[PDB]
Structure 1
């Protein structure tokens, strides 16, 4: 209901729908200084991020969100923590958590920081 929560949820929904259906379009939600750390691998800068995301087999994956937490930051950014499980077909692959730091630039929400970790947690 709160503004930061409405935007955070909308973004998360938008992010996973893009990821599970059109990864190539994800670049649109990042900026040059964005950072992504995927399973320990650091990809600093949009060029690096777009290459990594586009190098993922994921020729069939789907994310299932079990829980999400959103908070506004002092600088009016939105920090979001997502926890869930990513599947294949319908049978469970790893469990995961993902943190996003969202910032509004030229009036558009973009992700400046993306961190993803796989985890054998059922949540």
Structure 2
């Protein structure tokens, strides 16, 4: 493993931590501005419901019921092939107002003007 890539791995872990915290804060508490976290041409898929483009993603989010996400696990990887991070998050989600559900979410974030934005958002939830 390159020394460079040990650096990139750690860079990726930090940015993963901060992006995830800001992201889930913004989904639960500040949806009106959620579009800031997405590139104009990002693709979202929540439970198989697709949205193409930041504006449709914003619209989608405003139409979802209120939510509270509790993060448990976080994993992240540098993708070298501009730089992009693969991020895997998991926890429990409370959709207002239903029973508690568990969720897994895969991001690919990339940097624009020194700010990290979603390229791809995959969200899958299950019962119990």
CA contact (8 A) 2:78 2:86 kept: yes
Q: Post-superposition shift, 1:120?
A: 2.9
Given the alignment, which residue of 3, 6, 11 partners 2:19? Answer: 11
Quote the residue 2:85 is aligned against: 78
- The alpha carbon displacement at 1:84 in A equals 0.7
Q: What is the TM-score when the length of structure 2 is the normalising length?
A: 0.85
Could you list the structure 1 runs, at least 4 aligned residues long, displaced by more than 3 angstroms after superposition: none
Alignment match of 1:94 (pick from 79, 93, 101): 101
Which structure has the larger Rg? 2
> What is the CA–CA distance in structure 1 between the aligned matches of 2:102 and 2:70, rounded to whole Å?
9
Alignment of 1:22-101 (within 5 A): 22-58=30-66, 61-75=67-81, 76-87=83-94, 92-101=99-108
SS of 1:107's equivalent in the other structure is coil
- TM-score, reference length from structure 1: 0.88
Q: How many residue pairs are counted as aligned between the two chains? A: 118
**RMSD value, Cα:** 1.8
Higher relative helix content: 2
